């Protein structure tokens, strides 16, 4: 028997079997409904669409994400995503073998309970576990001492880990993510007189951000350079074949992680939260945390973000500390690679919450047995 691993994002869901090295199923965790009157009759069309369906047909649809900021906002949509995951794409009977689920730290307590309840009652999974995303990235990157900057859609967080001990008081969560970069990118795009007003082109803005955006190694000199000449401008075809051309704006969007004042967010950027998370640790371990500083999740994929991170923490690190950034190319998948290897450890097999224990205890078992 083999466990299922499904890393559940806030825009993208990644699933497969344990001991696989890359997930078999990846699709956007997106649900769509038709917003129009039908003309034809005898078409046999179906009510609502999931994932690559709702990507393909998006111009006909309205698209909703059931997860925002790592909180499952509507269970009645999410259950469709899981039903598509297990039955349609994987071709698996989830009643046969256990499942592992991944979650951002410090999110609402009820989220775990209700996800457990749905797993045991609806899917009848034989055993279940949930793991903090930032832990798995250390399994994936091969380390036992780490500080982890994990960002996707919905959530960013830092979690320090030293030789297999977490440091709960030092967890930093920060609600800034690719969705908030995208919403800001729409407004900055409007400055050049392109206007994107509904979800079906929000899905285009996301792709523009993915291909074209990049992080200035120092912002204001390059801001001046791009104002001074068109050399940094680059262009993109919309679906209709309109070329659109974008300049200083393409670095200006992914910067805002480092200056959340642009979004009107109160907190400091990811560099200052990473530093404060280290400094909340005690001094015996800080020297080792400075070397084991690990990028994870898709929002870290922007070119330059490692160099900008290394420079901007170096300016805060005491100069003897040779701080080092680890940014492997897989890292968009690293959380899943970690859940894959964790679920395959023999030592883990004790750890699962079995249905016997759930029926004995009810959903509150999760807080007790899990992290």
């Amino acid at each position: 028997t083999t466990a299922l691993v499904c890393d559940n994002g806030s825009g993208l869901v990644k699933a497969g079997f344990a001991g696989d090295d890359a997930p078999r199923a990846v699709f956007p965790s997106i649900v769509g409904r038709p917003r129009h009157q039908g003309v034809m009759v005898g078409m046999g069309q179906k009510d609502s669409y999931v994932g690559d369906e709702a990507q393909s047909k998006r111009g006909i649809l309205t698209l909703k994400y059931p997860i925002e900021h790592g909180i499952i906002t509507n269970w009645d949509d999410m259950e469709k995503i899981w039903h598509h995951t297990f039955y349609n794409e994987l071709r698996v009977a989830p009643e046969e073998h256990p499942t592992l689920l991944t979650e951002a730290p410090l999110n609402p307590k009820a989220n775990r309970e209700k996800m457990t309840q749905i797993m045991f009652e609806t899917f009848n999974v034989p055993a279940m576990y949930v793991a903090i995303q930032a832990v798995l990235s250390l399994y994936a990157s091969g380390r036992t001492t780490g500080i982890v900057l994990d960002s996707g859609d919905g959530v960013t967080h830092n979690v320090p880990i030293y030789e297999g001990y977490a440091l709960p008081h030092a967890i930093m969560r920060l609600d800034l993510a690719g969705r908030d970069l995208t919403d800001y990118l729409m407004k900055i795009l409007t400055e050049r007189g392109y206007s994107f007003v509904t979800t079906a082109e929000r899905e285009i803005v996301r792709d523009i951000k993915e291909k074209l955006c990049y992080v200035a190694l120092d912002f204001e000199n390059e801001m001046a350079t791009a104002a001074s000449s068109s050399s940094l401008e680059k262009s993109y075809e919309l679906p209709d074949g309109q070329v659109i051309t974008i300049g200083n704006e393409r670095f200006r969007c992914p910067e805002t992680l480092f200056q959340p004042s642009f979004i009107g967010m109160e907190s400091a950027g990811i560099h200052e939260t990473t530093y404060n998370s280290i400094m909340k640790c005690d001094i015996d371990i800080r020297k080792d945390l400075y070397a084991n500083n690990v990028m994870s999740g898709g929002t870290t994929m922007y070119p330059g973000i490692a160099d900008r991170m290394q420079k901007e923490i170096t300016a805060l690190a005491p100069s003897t500390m040779k701080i080092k950034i680890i940014a492997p190319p897989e890292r968009k998948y690293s959380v899943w690679i970690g859940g894959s290897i964790l679920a395959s450890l023999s030592t883990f097999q004790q750890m699962w919450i079995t249905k016997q224990e759930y029926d004995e205890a009810g959903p509150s078992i999760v807080h007790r047995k899990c992290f």
Binding site: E68, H69, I71, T73, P108, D175
Partner: peptide
């Protein structure tokens, strides 16, 4: 969420 934010 339930308070300080849309979720």
């Amino acid at each position: 969420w339930x308070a300080x934010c849309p979720a």
